[PDB]
Design an enzyme around this catalytic site. Structure first.
Site, PDB file in Angstrom:
ATOM      1  N   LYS A  36       0.829  -1.236   0.000  1.00  0.00           N
ATOM      2  CA  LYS A  36       0.000   0.000   0.000  1.00  0.00           C
ATOM      3  C   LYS A  36       0.853   1.272   0.000  1.00  0.00           C
ATOM      4  O   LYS A  36       0.500   2.180  -0.739  1.00  0.00           O
ATOM      5  CB  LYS A  36      -0.951   0.013   1.197  1.00  0.00           C
ATOM      6  CG  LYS A  36      -1.914  -1.157   1.311  1.00  0.00           C
ATOM      7  CD  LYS A  36      -2.912  -0.974   2.431  1.00  0.00           C
ATOM      8  CE  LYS A  36      -2.269  -0.733   3.778  1.00  0.00           C
ATOM      9  NZ  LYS A  36      -1.729  -1.981   4.363  1.00  0.00           N
ATOM     10  N   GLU A  38       0.961   6.087  11.387  1.00  0.00           N
ATOM     11  CA  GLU A  38       1.933   5.213  10.670  1.00  0.00           C
ATOM     12  C   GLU A  38       3.423   5.442  11.060  1.00  0.00           C
ATOM     13  O   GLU A  38       3.666   5.994  12.132  1.00  0.00           O
ATOM     14  CB  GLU A  38       1.650   5.352   9.159  1.00  0.00           C
ATOM     15  CG  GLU A  38       0.374   4.621   8.701  1.00  0.00           C
ATOM     16  CD  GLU A  38       0.367   3.118   9.051  1.00  0.00           C
ATOM     17  OE1 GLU A  38       1.448   2.494   9.027  1.00  0.00           O
ATOM     18  OE2 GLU A  38      -0.720   2.542   9.301  1.00  0.00           O
ATOM     19  N   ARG A  39       4.449   4.966  10.315  1.00  0.00           N
ATOM     20  CA  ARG A  39       5.859   5.065  10.754  1.00  0.00           C
ATOM     21  C   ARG A  39       6.441   6.479  10.711  1.00  0.00           C
ATOM     22  O   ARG A  39       6.390   7.158   9.690  1.00  0.00           O
ATOM     23  CB  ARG A  39       6.722   4.131   9.882  1.00  0.00           C
ATOM     24  CG  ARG A  39       6.341   2.643   9.978  1.00  0.00           C
ATOM     25  CD  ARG A  39       7.214   1.808   9.029  1.00  0.00           C
ATOM     26  NE  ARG A  39       6.912   0.367   9.099  1.00  0.00           N
ATOM     27  CZ  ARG A  39       6.000  -0.267   8.379  1.00  0.00           C
ATOM     28  NH1 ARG A  39       5.194   0.345   7.569  1.00  0.00           N
ATOM     29  NH2 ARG A  39       5.878  -1.553   8.447  1.00  0.00           N
TER      30      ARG A  39
END
Ligand SMILES: Nc1ncnc2c1ncn2[C@@H]1O[C@H](COP(=O)(O)OP(=O)(O)O)[C@@H](O)[C@H]1O
Ligand SMILES: [Mg+2]
Lengths: 456, 177, 79, 109
Positions: A153, A179-180
């Site tokens: 993704k 997210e990261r």
């Protein structure tokens, strides 16, 4: 006036105010000794309100004084946000100083009315074969990239940010929701070194953050995109992961006193999704083209969060782990993926029949899988043998080396036009390539490169 | 569960005993003293301690009230404490007065106006309300400058608004809708 | 309004004042402890019990503090 | 001191003790006049402890007196246990008389 903390449980805090000075729903509050921000979620009665902290609650205690600000969380909007990084509360997090803002907007708003809706059908070329064939995108529409952990993704999106910025000349808004932190750093420096940064607004609330931040970052990024749309511009809105907005809501739901629904989800799951999703739309004033990644828990597409998201999108791209395991990238599933633009009146009969032909061949090949697994291919009819051979070639021709995937393998990236995409699959369906070997179609961009690869 | 849901059995038991023994005024005074005394900052603290027994909490509250609690009222306080309900005393007193007012066919009516009204007007409103409700009416008249003119009557859950502010609000909603 | 004779009786009552940094255990169950009176405790603060045992403050409610025991809880008791 | 049975629901029994005599978790309690042992599982507060009966609860009633033993279920240990059949409490289920024990140890450590 001011209130006093009466209870603290994780990210949720209860504050008591005088009966004549109780703050409104979604109103922002500030703790006096630490300046921590709280957002009011509900009024409990007797002057008590329940709120979610927009930061860490470690070190807070009962009896601390709290100030009501008289308004919701307000963030800077307009040209001053381009080339800058901001947090959930609109503060700069790039060490480049204060934002030169002209005005601030509250993060909570109603969706545009039924009379303000736009009827756009203009085709958007992505340069990616499988997407342009079975999932055609449209300008001012919504796209969702559905997939489990490690399926493609973030790579398949970054390839779309790279390819869509070729024809688009306006502004972009990026919202990083749960997210990261390393990928936010990689993306910021990549655009800064490429000189693309002065046309993108960046907002972050990553996995390291408390539940309140992850729950409201999506609204902060969307508020900046709505300012540019309402100015009459055509803008791109990218959401790093829309599932994290819903998940941050699940972590807090039991603390808000709500009874749980199926598989532990909040009872408000579909409403929380609709209140955000309906604001992400094009209007008669300007357009918002939006791409959102949708995480699929434990690879289950029937899970309540993914299941509730499909109805909010114009194009649905479904990534598969079984396809990624064979070596094929992008790992899109043609039989599960679909688009509102896949209509003879929108894309023309030649494209429509090529796409329908590819789906018919792949569907028939999927029906033979169990027979082929037990008895092998040699027992099939002469018609099924020819169809399985074409299905294997179509499945390999859908693969494509990306310009963002070059670091993983070494191969150079490929951009394929819609004309070249239709010509390749039409030829394979007609039988014009029945003599070339099956491995010649794997990772080659346009159809002519499959002819050159077969020479080795 | 509301505090009114938990206080109902106790307020009703105290009312029926007081009614049957012709002690309605004695229990009205006793429950009022207990409601006020249990709300005091030092007594409120003493009743919440985890080391004291229900009987120790009850005796301390009885010794403080003393003269104001007869043998039945002392027995009632020891019953509320054994069931761990001492926090409901203010609600029990409130619900007891509602049962008493309804029994004695009495109604307390709050009244608000833009500017002061004469005794002639108060007595005209009082006879009209007593004739409509078929109860004794006690008008707690007051003023509120938020009203442009006229008066508002609040007879418990029933409200009768004849003020100019209400008419202006009806017009705003009529034009906006 | 409470009377001056009753207010005098209230001032004579045996009501124990508790320091804001001290508390009393109400209950013990499966490594979770409920405490009464830690008025100035912070969310995530270390709580000290007898015999060298420590707890962590997780639930700060109106009337009590909920804590998780950072070791063996079977030696902890009510009061 | 001694406590009183306040509630009986199947094998689960609640016992109330004076505030200065509440028994510890895993402590063994003895019902007076009946051969029934209760192991303490949780301290509920208000001097009340929740316990599980190490035998049938039939015929028990509320208000019976219960005695604290000061320690967990304690069983005979050593050479005397060889060639013998015992229950969970260390009682000799075989009809061979008392166990010639010299020492007893608590089951929790
Ligand atoms: N060709 C490839 N070879 C190996 N991994 C790839 C390739 N193309 C994409 N990926 C995978 O794409 C993933 C992108 O994010 P993904 O795991 O799918 O989403 P998410 O992290 O957001 O849940 C990376 O973790 C990476 O492992
Ligand atoms: Mg990813």
């Amino acid at each position: 006036s001011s209130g006093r903390i009466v209870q603290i449980i994780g990210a949720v805090i209860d504050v008591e105010f005088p009966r004549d000075a109780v703050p409104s729903i979604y109103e922002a509050l500030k703790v006096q000794g630490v300046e921590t921000t709280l957002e009011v979620q509900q009024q409990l009665g007797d002057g008590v309100v329940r709120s979610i902290a927009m930061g860490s609650t470690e070190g807070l205690k009962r009896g601390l004084n709290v100030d009501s600000t008289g308004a919701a969380i307000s963030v800077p909007v307009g040209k001053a946000t381009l080339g800058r990084i901001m947090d959930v509360l609109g503060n700069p997090i790039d060490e480049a100083g204060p934002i030169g803002e002209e005005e601030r907007w509250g993060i909570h708003r109603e969706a545009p009315s039924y009379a303000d809706q736009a009827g756009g059908n203009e085709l958007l070329e992505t340069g990616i074969k499988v997407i342009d064939l079975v999932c055609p995108f449209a300008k001012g529409g919504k796209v969702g990239l559905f997939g489990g952990a490690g399926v493609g993704k973030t790579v398949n999106m970054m390839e779309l940010i790279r390819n869509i910025a070729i024809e688009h000349s306006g502004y972009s808004v990026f919202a990083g929701v749960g997210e990261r932190t390393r990928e936010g750093n990689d993306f910021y420096h990549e655009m800064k070194d490429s000189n693309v940064l002065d046309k993108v607004a960046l907002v972050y609330g990553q996995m390291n953050e408390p539940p309140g931040n992850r729950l409201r970052v999506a609204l902060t990024g969307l508020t900046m995109a709505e300012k540019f749309r309402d100015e009459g511009r055509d803008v791109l809105l990218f959401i790093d992961n829309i599932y994290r907005y819903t998940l941050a809501g699940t972590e807090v739901s039991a603390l808000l006193g709500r009874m749980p629904s199926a598989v532990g989800y909040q009872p408000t799951l579909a409403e929380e999704m609709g209140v955000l999703q309906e604001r992400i739309t094009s209007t008669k004033k300007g357009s918002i083209t939006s791409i959102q990644a949708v995480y699929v828990p434990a690879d289950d597409l029937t899970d309540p969060s993914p299941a509730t998201t499909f109805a909010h999108l114009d194009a649905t791209v479904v990534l598969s782990r079984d396809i990624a395991s064979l070596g094929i990238y992008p790992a899109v599933d043609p039989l599960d993926s679909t688009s509102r633009q896949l209509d003879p009146l929108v894309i023309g009969q030649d494209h429509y029949d090529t796409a329908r032909g590819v789906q018919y061949v792949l569907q028939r090949y999927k029906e033979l899988k169990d027979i082929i697994a037990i008895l092998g291919m040699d027992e099939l009819s002469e018609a099924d043998k020819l169809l399985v051979a074409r299905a294997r070639k179509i499945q390999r021709f859908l693969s494509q080396p990306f310009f963002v995937a070059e670091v993983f393998t070494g191969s150079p990236g490929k951009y394929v036009s819609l004309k070249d995409t239709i010509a390749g699959f039409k030829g394979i369906l007609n039988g014009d390539y029945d003599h070339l070997p099956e491995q010649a179609f794997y990772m080659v961009g346009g159809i002519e490169e499959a002819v050159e690869k077969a020479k080795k | 569960a509301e505090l009114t849901t938990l206080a109902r059995p106790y307020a009703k038991a105290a009312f029926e005993y007081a009614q049957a023994h012709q002690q309605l005024a004695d229990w009205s005074a006793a429950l009022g003293v207990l409601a006020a005394v249990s709300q005091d900052d030092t007594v409120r603290q003493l009743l919440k301690e985890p080391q004291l027994t229900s009987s120790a909490k009850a005796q301390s509250l009885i010794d403080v009230c003393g003269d104001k609690l007869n043998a039945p009222a002392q027995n009632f306080v020891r019953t509320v404490a054994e069931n761990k309900r001492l926090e409901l005393l203010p609600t029990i007193a409130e619900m007891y007065e509602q049962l008493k007012a309804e029994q004695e066919k009495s109604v307390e009516v709050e009244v608000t106006s833009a500017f002061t009204l004469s005794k002639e007007q108060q007595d005209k409103l009082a006879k009209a309300l007593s004739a409509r409700l078929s109860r004794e009416v006690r008008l707690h008249a007051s003023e509120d400058a938020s009203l442009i003119g006229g008066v508002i009557i609040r007879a418990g859950d029933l409200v009768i608004d004849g003020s100019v502010r209400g008419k202006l609000a009806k017009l705003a909603e009529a034009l906006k809708s | 309004e409470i009377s001056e004779i009753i207010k005098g009786r209230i001032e004579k009552l045996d009501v124990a004042s508790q320091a804001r940094n001290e508390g009393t255990i109400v209950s013990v169950s499966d490594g979770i402890v409920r405490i009464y009176g830690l008025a100035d405790v912070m969310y995530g603060e270390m709580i000290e019990f007898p015999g060298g045992v420590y707890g962590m403050a997780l639930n700060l409610e109106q009337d009590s503090v909920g804590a998780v025991v950072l070791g063996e809880y079977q030696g902890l008791a009510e009061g």
